[PDB]
């Protein structure tokens, strides 16, 4: 990794050798195509899995779903010669990639559904979720079908960095920037193009010296557990708007709403969308310990105030 | 943060945004003009500290030494202009620093105040100040790097985080420092050190908030925490246990995973081990072909210290 | 100038301070906002120059034409408020800025100061100001000060040149020429021209000025550097070249529909001829006298044009 | 080619293609032909009646100093009595007469030593090396040199550089940097540093504008300096007898301590350069010049101030 870097704040121009981390969480992953190793071998594994009765594989990353989208036309016509007749149909869940609990099985009008909905035939469970791994540098072919059921994200594409008082928790579809002010550490950026559920591996987190009930992004949704994951006056956002499209976290009150500090709110509560079902705006909002600048999101339906901003549509993560 | 990397040959140039930490910043040892707060208030603070019975000071980095070396003239000038008897003398320890006990004291013939050097029998290191400096900013020069420093009125055993750095990538990680660089990679399992340059013997503990991953205990860490080293799973080499007693108090080290000329590479499962870190050579500077290592790895680890090759506690005669 | 640079052949990553020349020969000239010296004064200058009796003002660079097209409205407002009644309208030549021979005049039925006017019969290319303008600094992004000094050489505040071993680059906002040295001699491997100027390269911005004419590839008149780096073996000067076209480019490759066979029975030098005839057919038969084995060809508006040395066994009238 | 500058404070960049030259790139590891063929060439040169060599630049001398021991070892292995020694001229390298010859009782082949009456420079080899490759490798800019058997009095053109811009220019080299700018008409030098003393002429194909006559060039031609209109300071003619034989120089536009210069139309001029002080370390504040400028120029070399030929005490 030979290169240069410029920091206009610190006006430094060091070059040479080292370690660099990038911010490729935006629309830049479509540049390089994804070629799984030995597509012929994958057909045998798919055929073996169908024997038990597994409904299908629900992907965990947008890259995984794009791999299936690209290979749908390239693998469906392959096994036609072998006369196996296992049709592959790819559904389109937008960004609500959920967790399944099953690994692959060993080699010993049917349709192999992928990302099937909550149909009565079988639930989200009884499906393969995260039984895959990258070979290297995730030209090259980088895919591996392993039988190791793990409840974390794959660590060959992730990253993290600290450069003094800065911070960064990089990921292909996730990014969290942190900085230190007045001693404690705070969050000032957070984006997520999807809704994963693999927990951040402990080998890529910075400063594991915190417990639960004090972070901002819970570890279930795929948030790092670190001292750099915290905002003053806010606890873990269990009932937050984490089931949405590409998000963003802003430290500002929303256009039409306002927050009035009080002391008779209903504890934690649950988050509420800015626009209620009744169509009437409610400027009455109360807070207990949060700072007077509220936190604002930017996703599918717009503003979703956190749990602590109570009035006087709801998150369904659990 | 608006930088990027290059790859000669394949002709790849991917540019974007992120966080960058470099290794060649550990090459320009003497390129910084350290600036304290001011000649006046610092002299007043050290005079106040000496007022309540303090022998002297003790440098914590290889930067504070040059700061005092460059500002001793101004300190003496302030002492002369203040008509004060106190004076400071700066000796030259090679690279070894030890632990003090007190910070700069509270505000409200020739004097002696040893900034750093051989500790006389007058008093132990207890009657000294060790860690009272905080870096608020790193560099404001257009291309060069001038360092400003702050005053701290409390005793903290941790280093200062304004100069550190630690980044991880795909099967790679590094913990940077102006006088230290640890490089790791993961092959067939866990992580392991493949490059480790140490240039001084500090004694400030690496902050807990700059360690990439705390899934490790104080049982199998190569560089000890007290010597100054990250408490992270990236800071170890398989087959070699904690180096609680090693050649960390020497000239710039270059830990290498190879043997040394004139030596023997044999692994013995019964020879004595886990004692001290004895010198590889003898008084005459000649090789001894009797080295043994315990449960180890085939490529031995050899230090490059003052006298040349050194061996860890896993290798004994 | 502080910065960093790379070299894919030398494998360098040096940084520091020095001199930098860039390849901003793209459509970056439209980003600069041209602010002449006190547009109120420019009205008086134009009024004077008109009173002494000069037809128009054929700009030399695309920057000047863009400046005039942008500031015609403001100058119109100025001499409409001040009651001067000398109408100024900006016409549009494609890229064929020619040479006029007059500097501005000294200070002290509608008037028509046509800018970049076509060669009409009302008055010739004379009575036209050509190059009485001078960039000030930092080539308001870019200023401009009027002068009264007739000049043939280009304006030196925007040009550039650099040699870094065996490489070369004669830069300009609307020009580029990347030279290289192989087997001792120097050649040309890149050439672009977004327009057709006629200001000569100044002798203070040419590298290795030690050669005469009859050995160049782009003559001085078209605005070509006078240097040993401006030369291709087997070709003399391109006096009768296709230099009156749109953005050009020189290629060391025969055009797809044609090929050239080395021979010794051609019809002298003559003049350049397009590959395609008037009727739309392509001529596949070409010959040569002393040119090198790989033929050269341009790519402008009408398409491929071969140099003077290639003949077939109303066109470009540069002369 | 894909590099760019910076605009600190304005926080903007202009990154693209072009040509870049630099000053403070400042290590080096020169590699000759090979330990064998070079040994054969120098052996043949000794056989044909050449006393020794003569280094031309601080690169060739360093290469010889580094590789003389290996050359002697190859000589011992091949059983030849020739031995080479690398004396140390301070920073002065002078001219030879002959190039290397084609391939096919302790003898002495001094690399660059004294001018003893043993033999003059006539029987010496001066410039017979060409740098085929430059830079590369791990930021060491390794340099590979190929023997050349023809006599030329021009420097090696693969390590030079010369750029011009809007009212700025610079002639570059690993041991030379002339910086010119244009103010109120003509060009003038505003920075000049020479870390060596060579006698190779600047190549004619790397001079930015040769509209100059060889009578108004500040740095002369034989000493090694660009032949260009950018190479002069107004009011000063050619310094043929200058303080050029020193360690790293710095042409500065200022007076000297304890000395003052007054333009006098009576005293003579155009002589030889003399130090501002004397052999006893005493300054002489009686300096006069003919046509000069208000700020005097002074070379800062080994001995400190030196005044050009237009200033006499």
Author numbering:
A (entry chain b): 1 to 108, 130 to 159, 165 to 338, 346 to 351
B (entry chain B): 1 to 108, 129 to 337
C (entry chain a): 1 to 108, 129 to 159, 165 to 338, 346 to 351
D (entry chain A): 1 to 26, 31 to 108, 129 to 337
The article reads:
As the multifunctional protein within the Flaviviridae family, Non-structural protein 1 (NS1) is considered as a promising target against flaviviruses. The NS1 monomer consists of three distinct domains: a β-roll domain (residues 1–29, β1–2), a wing domain (residues 38–151, β4–7 and α1–2), and a β-ladder domain (residues 181–352, β10–20). β3, β8, and β9 are from a ‘‘connector’’ domain (residues 30–37 and 152–180) and connect the wing to the β-roll and β-ladder domains.
Here, we observed that the recombinant sNS1 dimer from a YFV 17D strain exists in multiple-oligomeric states, predominantly in the tetrameric form. The final reconstruction of 215,543 particles yielded a structure (named YFV_NS1_tetramer) at a 3.57 Å resolution. The structure of the YFV_NS1_tetramer presents an asymmetrical “H” shape, which consists of two NS1 dimers (Aa and Bb) stacked through the inner hydrophobic surfaces. The distance between the centroids of Monomer A and B (42.5 Å) is smaller than the distance of Monomer a and b (54.6 Å). The buried interface area between dimer Aa and Bb is 853.7 Å2 via a PISA calculation. The tetrameric structure showed that the interface between dimer Aa and Bb is mainly contributed by the hydrophobic residues from the β-roll domains and greasy fingers. These observations also indicate that the YFV tetramer is in a conformation that is distinct from the loose tetramer and stable tetramer. Therefore, we define this structure as a “semi-stable” tetramer, which may represent the intermediated state between the stable tetramer and the loose tetramer.
